């Protein structure tokens, strides 16, 4: 087509979705991780994660307001990844990289799994 | 705004 | 902080939200324009438009599944703006610029109003 | 990935 494009549009949308998350506006699901609870928007979770995409396209699970993650999932690793979903920023540190990579593999967040693999390989 |  | 950032994350999120819109997955509102109906996600509409932000933060209207726009709003202008919300791409043409600008002013989409004003000024 |  002959469209024009606003460069900052996608980033501004994500910033506003994160503002809605901060203020708990229109959040429609609780993600339970080892008794730690995280409120979010199903659509943002689906847009970021192959696991959430699969969960919320399921005809029964799409209607659930609570999702319990596997007990092996670390709440801090999940928190870091949820923040990344809403900001594009990943707080990757020596002390959390193993939990973050394991959580990203479970959530099916391929680009995160990729940078974790590379950061681990650089330290070996 | 740009030409994509 | 010491975060790393994935450059394409925001664009990939928006692309996935538009794929959900195309497939009518988790859409939670119908926008009615001169008897033309558009399904969308409230959170994306709020992230893009000052009007929808105001509507869906209202304690009564946040729960509505149907929103009727002012009868002066042109369905094609709305359609072009809804596409822009989900893609960052604006189909601005000589034949639609007046309807698009009027719709963007009503929806409170300041960057769109700005490029319409500039494109109109260039032709005068 | 970049340093923002
Ligand atoms: O690594 C990843 C990130 C990711 C996101 C999603 N999401 C969607 N894919 C396609 N259409 C709509 C949506 Cl919401 C699916 C798989 C994966 N895998
Ligand atoms: O031009 C525009 C675009 C736009 C978007 C919104 N949205 C939000 N603002 C702040 N926190 C959350 C959200 Cl969802 C409000 C006003 C305007 N005005
Ligand atoms: Cl990712
Ligand atoms: Cl705008």
């Amino acid at each position: 087509d002959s469209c024009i494009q606003f460069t900052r549009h996608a980033s501004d949308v994500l910033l506003n979705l994160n503002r809605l998350r901060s203020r708990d506006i229109l959040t429609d699901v609780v993600i339970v991780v080892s008794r730690e609870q995280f409120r979010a928007h199903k659509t943002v979770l689906m847009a970021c994660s192959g696991l959430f995409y699969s969960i919320f396209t399921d005809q029964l699970k799409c209607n659930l307001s609570v999702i319990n993650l596997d007990p092996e999932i670390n709440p801090e690793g999940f928190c870091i990844l949820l923040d990344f979903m809403y900001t594009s920023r990943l707080n990757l540190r020596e002390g959390n990289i193993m939990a973050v990579m394991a959580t990203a593999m479970y959530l099916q967040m391929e680009h995160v799994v990729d940078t974790c693999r590379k950061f681990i390989k650089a330290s070996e | 705004w740009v030409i994509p």
Side-chain angles (χ1 to χ4, degrees), chain A residues 1-58 60-109 111-124, chain B:
Chain A
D1 218 300
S2 60
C3 288
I4 57 175
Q5 181 191 66
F6 188 69
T7 301
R8 295 293 291 160
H9 183 73
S11 181
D12 286 354
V13 166
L14 195 68
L15 178 69
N16 283 339
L17 292 174
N18 195 36
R19 286 163 174 173
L20 294 183
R21 182 174 66 120
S22 292
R23 303 174 71 215
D24 198 36
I25 296 165
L26 292 204
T27 48
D28 52 15
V29 74
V30 179
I31 307 304
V32 180
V33 192
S34 291
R35 291 198 190 91
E36 293 248 61
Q37 289 187 11
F38 302 89
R39 296 205 48 88
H41 302 97
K42 288 174 188 181
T43 56
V44 174
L45 297 183
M46 297 166 85
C48 296
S49 152
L51 187 69
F52 289 125
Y53 175 69
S54 289
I55 292 166
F56 301 120
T57 53
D58 176 81
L60 279 177
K61 297 184 192 77
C62 65
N63 294 139
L64 293 175
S65 60
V66 179
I67 302 297
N68 303 301
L69 302 194
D70 185 291
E72 281 281 286
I73 304 302
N74 176 254
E76 188 191 36
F78 185 76
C79 185
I80 287 160
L81 290 171
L82 184 63
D83 282 346
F84 168 75
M85 293 186 197
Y86 280 86
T87 66
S88 310
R89 303 167 57 87
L90 184 73
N91 183 22
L92 198 57
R93 301 177 59 85
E94 185 182 45
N96 69 31
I97 187 152
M98 298 311 287
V100 172
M101 186 169 75
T103 314
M105 287 169 69
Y106 169 77
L107 293 182
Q108 302 165 32
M109 293 175 74
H111 295 299
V112 175
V113 177
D114 185 59
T115 197
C116 283
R117 282 221 246 270
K118 292 191 203 300
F119 274 46
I120 290 157
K121 196 194 175 186
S123 277
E124 84 189 11
Chain B
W1 292 85
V2 301
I3 302 303

Short mmCIF file of all heavy atoms in Angstrom, two decimals, chain A residues 8-38:
data_model
loop_
_atom_site.label_atom_id
_atom_site.label_comp_id
_atom_site.label_asym_id
_atom_site.label_seq_id
_atom_site.Cartn_x
_atom_site.Cartn_y
_atom_site.Cartn_z
N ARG A 8 7.34 5.57 16.48
CA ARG A 8 7.18 5.35 17.93
C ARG A 8 5.85 4.72 18.36
O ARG A 8 5.66 4.48 19.56
CB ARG A 8 7.42 6.67 18.70
CG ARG A 8 8.85 7.24 18.60
CD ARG A 8 9.88 6.37 19.30
NE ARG A 8 9.74 6.37 20.76
CZ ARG A 8 10.24 5.44 21.57
NH1 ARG A 8 10.89 4.39 21.06
NH2 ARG A 8 10.08 5.53 22.88
N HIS A 9 4.93 4.45 17.41
CA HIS A 9 3.58 3.92 17.75
C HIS A 9 3.60 2.64 18.58
O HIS A 9 2.94 2.59 19.63
CB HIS A 9 2.69 3.74 16.51
CG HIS A 9 1.30 3.28 16.89
ND1 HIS A 9 0.41 4.14 17.48
CD2 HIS A 9 0.71 2.07 16.76
CE1 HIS A 9 -0.70 3.45 17.70
NE2 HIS A 9 -0.57 2.18 17.28
N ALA A 10 4.32 1.60 18.12
CA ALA A 10 4.36 0.32 18.85
C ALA A 10 4.91 0.48 20.27
O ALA A 10 4.34 -0.10 21.19
CB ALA A 10 5.15 -0.73 18.07
N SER A 11 5.98 1.26 20.44
CA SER A 11 6.59 1.50 21.75
C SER A 11 5.62 2.25 22.67
O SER A 11 5.51 1.92 23.85
CB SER A 11 7.89 2.28 21.60
OG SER A 11 8.49 2.48 22.86
N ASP A 12 4.90 3.26 22.11
CA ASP A 12 3.93 4.07 22.87
C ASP A 12 2.77 3.19 23.32
O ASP A 12 2.29 3.34 24.43
CB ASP A 12 3.41 5.25 22.03
CG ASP A 12 4.40 6.39 21.84
OD1 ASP A 12 5.49 6.36 22.47
OD2 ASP A 12 4.09 7.31 21.07
N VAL A 13 2.32 2.28 22.43
CA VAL A 13 1.24 1.33 22.79
C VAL A 13 1.70 0.47 23.98
O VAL A 13 0.97 0.30 24.95
CB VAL A 13 0.82 0.45 21.59
CG1 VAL A 13 -0.03 -0.75 22.05
CG2 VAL A 13 0.07 1.28 20.55
N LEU A 14 2.90 -0.09 23.88
CA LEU A 14 3.39 -0.97 24.94
C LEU A 14 3.56 -0.22 26.27
O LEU A 14 3.18 -0.75 27.32
CB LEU A 14 4.70 -1.66 24.53
CG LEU A 14 5.10 -2.86 25.42
CD1 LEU A 14 4.13 -4.03 25.23
CD2 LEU A 14 6.53 -3.32 25.09
N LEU A 15 4.07 1.02 26.20
CA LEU A 15 4.21 1.88 27.38
C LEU A 15 2.84 2.09 28.04
O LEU A 15 2.71 1.92 29.26
CB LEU A 15 4.83 3.22 26.96
CG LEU A 15 5.02 4.25 28.06
CD1 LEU A 15 6.11 3.80 29.02
CD2 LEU A 15 5.41 5.60 27.45
N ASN A 16 1.80 2.37 27.23
CA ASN A 16 0.45 2.54 27.76
C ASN A 16 -0.12 1.26 28.35
O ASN A 16 -0.80 1.31 29.37
CB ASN A 16 -0.47 3.18 26.72
CG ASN A 16 -0.22 4.66 26.59
OD1 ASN A 16 0.33 5.29 27.50
ND2 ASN A 16 -0.60 5.26 25.47
N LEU A 17 0.14 0.10 27.71
CA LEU A 17 -0.30 -1.18 28.26
C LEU A 17 0.37 -1.41 29.62
O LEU A 17 -0.27 -1.91 30.54
CB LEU A 17 0.01 -2.34 27.29
CG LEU A 17 -0.81 -2.30 25.98
CD1 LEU A 17 -0.33 -3.39 25.01
CD2 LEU A 17 -2.35 -2.41 26.24
N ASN A 18 1.67 -1.06 29.73
CA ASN A 18 2.35 -1.22 31.03
C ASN A 18 1.76 -0.26 32.10
O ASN A 18 1.64 -0.65 33.26
CB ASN A 18 3.86 -1.02 30.89
CG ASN A 18 4.61 -1.52 32.10
OD1 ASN A 18 4.25 -2.54 32.71
ND2 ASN A 18 5.66 -0.83 32.46
N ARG A 19 1.35 0.97 31.70
CA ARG A 19 0.69 1.91 32.62
C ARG A 19 -0.63 1.32 33.12
O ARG A 19 -0.94 1.43 34.30
CB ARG A 19 0.43 3.27 31.95
CG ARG A 19 1.69 4.09 31.77
CD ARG A 19 1.48 5.21 30.76
NE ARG A 19 2.64 6.09 30.69
CZ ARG A 19 2.80 7.07 29.80
NH1 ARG A 19 1.89 7.27 28.85
NH2 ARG A 19 3.87 7.84 29.85
N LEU A 20 -1.40 0.66 32.22
CA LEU A 20 -2.65 0.00 32.62
C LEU A 20 -2.32 -1.13 33.60
O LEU A 20 -3.00 -1.27 34.63
CB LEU A 20 -3.38 -0.57 31.41
CG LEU A 20 -3.94 0.45 30.39
CD1 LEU A 20 -4.71 -0.27 29.29
CD2 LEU A 20 -4.84 1.50 31.08
N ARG A 21 -1.25 -1.92 33.31
CA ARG A 21 -0.85 -2.98 34.25
C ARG A 21 -0.51 -2.42 35.66
O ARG A 21 -1.00 -2.97 36.68
CB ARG A 21 0.35 -3.78 33.69
CG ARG A 21 0.73 -4.91 34.65
CD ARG A 21 1.79 -5.81 34.08
NE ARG A 21 3.07 -5.14 33.91
CZ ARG A 21 4.21 -5.49 34.51
NH1 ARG A 21 4.22 -6.48 35.40
NH2 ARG A 21 5.33 -4.85 34.24
N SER A 22 0.30 -1.35 35.72
CA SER A 22 0.72 -0.70 36.96
C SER A 22 -0.48 -0.29 37.80
O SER A 22 -0.49 -0.50 39.02
CB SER A 22 1.55 0.54 36.66
OG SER A 22 2.81 0.23 36.09
N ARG A 23 -1.50 0.27 37.13
CA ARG A 23 -2.71 0.78 37.79
C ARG A 23 -3.79 -0.29 37.92
O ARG A 23 -4.88 0.01 38.43
CB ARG A 23 -3.20 2.01 37.04
CG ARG A 23 -2.13 3.09 36.96
CD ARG A 23 -2.57 4.24 36.11
NE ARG A 23 -3.62 5.01 36.78
CZ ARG A 23 -4.62 5.60 36.14
NH1 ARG A 23 -4.72 5.50 34.83
NH2 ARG A 23 -5.53 6.28 36.82
N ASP A 24 -3.49 -1.53 37.50
CA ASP A 24 -4.39 -2.68 37.56
C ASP A 24 -5.70 -2.42 36.78
O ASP A 24 -6.80 -2.83 37.19
CB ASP A 24 -4.67 -3.12 39.02
CG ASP A 24 -5.23 -4.52 39.15
OD1 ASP A 24 -4.83 -5.40 38.35
OD2 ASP A 24 -6.07 -4.73 40.04
N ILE A 25 -5.58 -1.71 35.66
CA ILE A 25 -6.72 -1.38 34.82
C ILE A 25 -6.94 -2.43 33.75
O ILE A 25 -6.04 -2.69 32.94
CB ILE A 25 -6.60 0.04 34.21
CG1 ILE A 25 -6.60 1.13 35.33
CG2 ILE A 25 -7.71 0.30 33.17
CD1 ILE A 25 -6.10 2.51 34.80
N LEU A 26 -8.15 -3.02 33.74
CA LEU A 26 -8.59 -4.02 32.76
C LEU A 26 -7.74 -5.30 32.72
O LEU A 26 -7.84 -6.07 31.75
CB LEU A 26 -8.75 -3.43 31.36
CG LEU A 26 -9.90 -2.41 31.14
CD1 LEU A 26 -10.28 -2.38 29.71
CD2 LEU A 26 -11.14 -2.73 31.96
N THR A 27 -7.00 -5.59 33.80
CA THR A 27 -6.25 -6.85 33.92
C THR A 27 -7.36 -7.91 34.06
O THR A 27 -8.42 -7.64 34.64
CB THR A 27 -5.35 -6.83 35.15
OG1 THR A 27 -6.13 -6.38 36.25
CG2 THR A 27 -4.13 -5.91 34.96
N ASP A 28 -7.18 -9.06 33.41
CA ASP A 28 -8.22 -10.06 33.35
C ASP A 28 -7.77 -11.45 33.71
O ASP A 28 -8.48 -12.42 33.46
CB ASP A 28 -8.82 -10.05 31.93
CG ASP A 28 -7.80 -10.16 30.81
OD1 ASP A 28 -6.63 -10.53 31.10
OD2 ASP A 28 -8.15 -9.85 29.66
N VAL A 29 -6.58 -11.55 34.30
CA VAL A 29 -6.06 -12.86 34.74
C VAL A 29 -5.03 -12.67 35.83
O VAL A 29 -4.34 -11.63 35.88
CB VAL A 29 -5.47 -13.69 33.54
CG1 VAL A 29 -4.12 -13.16 33.04
CG2 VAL A 29 -5.38 -15.20 33.88
N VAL A 30 -4.92 -13.68 36.71
CA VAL A 30 -3.90 -13.78 37.75
C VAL A 30 -3.05 -15.00 37.38
O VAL A 30 -3.59 -16.08 37.13
CB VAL A 30 -4.51 -13.96 39.17
CG1 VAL A 30 -3.43 -14.09 40.24
CG2 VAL A 30 -5.45 -12.82 39.52
N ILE A 31 -1.72 -14.82 37.35
CA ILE A 31 -0.78 -15.90 37.11
C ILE A 31 -0.20 -16.22 38.48
O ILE A 31 0.38 -15.34 39.13
CB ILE A 31 0.33 -15.55 36.09
CG1 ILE A 31 -0.27 -15.02 34.74
CG2 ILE A 31 1.24 -16.75 35.85
CD1 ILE A 31 -1.32 -15.98 34.04
N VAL A 32 -0.39 -17.47 38.92
CA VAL A 32 0.08 -17.93 40.24
C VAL A 32 1.38 -18.71 40.05
O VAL A 32 1.41 -19.72 39.33
CB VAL A 32 -1.01 -18.76 40.98
CG1 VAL A 32 -0.52 -19.23 42.36
CG2 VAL A 32 -2.30 -17.96 41.14
N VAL A 33 2.43 -18.27 40.76
CA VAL A 33 3.77 -18.87 40.68
C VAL A 33 4.18 -19.13 42.12
O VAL A 33 4.56 -18.19 42.82
CB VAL A 33 4.75 -17.95 39.91
CG1 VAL A 33 6.04 -18.70 39.57
CG2 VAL A 33 4.11 -17.38 38.64
N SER A 34 4.34 -20.41 42.53
CA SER A 34 4.80 -20.74 43.89
C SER A 34 4.17 -19.80 44.97
O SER A 34 4.89 -19.18 45.76
CB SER A 34 6.33 -20.74 43.97
OG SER A 34 6.91 -21.82 43.26
N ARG A 35 2.83 -19.64 44.92
CA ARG A 35 2.00 -18.79 45.79
C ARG A 35 2.29 -17.26 45.67
O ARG A 35 1.94 -16.49 46.58
CB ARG A 35 2.04 -19.23 47.27
CG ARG A 35 1.34 -20.56 47.53
CD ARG A 35 1.04 -20.72 49.00
NE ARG A 35 0.59 -22.08 49.32
CZ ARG A 35 1.39 -23.07 49.69
NH1 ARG A 35 2.70 -22.87 49.78
NH2 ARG A 35 0.90 -24.27 49.96
N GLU A 36 2.92 -16.84 44.58
CA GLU A 36 3.15 -15.42 44.29
C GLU A 36 2.19 -15.14 43.15
O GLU A 36 2.08 -15.96 42.24
CB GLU A 36 4.60 -15.12 43.90
CG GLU A 36 5.56 -15.34 45.07
CD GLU A 36 6.21 -14.09 45.61
OE1 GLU A 36 5.48 -13.19 46.09
OE2 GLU A 36 7.46 -14.01 45.56
N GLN A 37 1.48 -14.01 43.21
CA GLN A 37 0.42 -13.74 42.24
C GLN A 37 0.77 -12.55 41.40
O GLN A 37 1.25 -11.55 41.93
CB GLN A 37 -0.89 -13.50 43.00
CG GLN A 37 -1.46 -14.77 43.63
CD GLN A 37 -2.83 -14.59 44.24
OE1 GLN A 37 -3.51 -13.58 44.06
NE2 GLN A 37 -3.25 -15.60 44.98
N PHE A 38 0.54 -12.66 40.08
CA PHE A 38 0.84 -11.58 39.13
C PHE A 38 -0.38 -11.30 38.27
O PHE A 38 -0.84 -12.19 37.56
CB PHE A 38 2.03 -11.98 38.23
CG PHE A 38 3.28 -12.30 39.00
CD1 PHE A 38 3.53 -13.59 39.45
CD2 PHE A 38 4.24 -11.32 39.24
CE1 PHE A 38 4.69 -13.89 40.17
CE2 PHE A 38 5.40 -11.62 39.96
CZ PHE A 38 5.63 -12.91 40.41
#
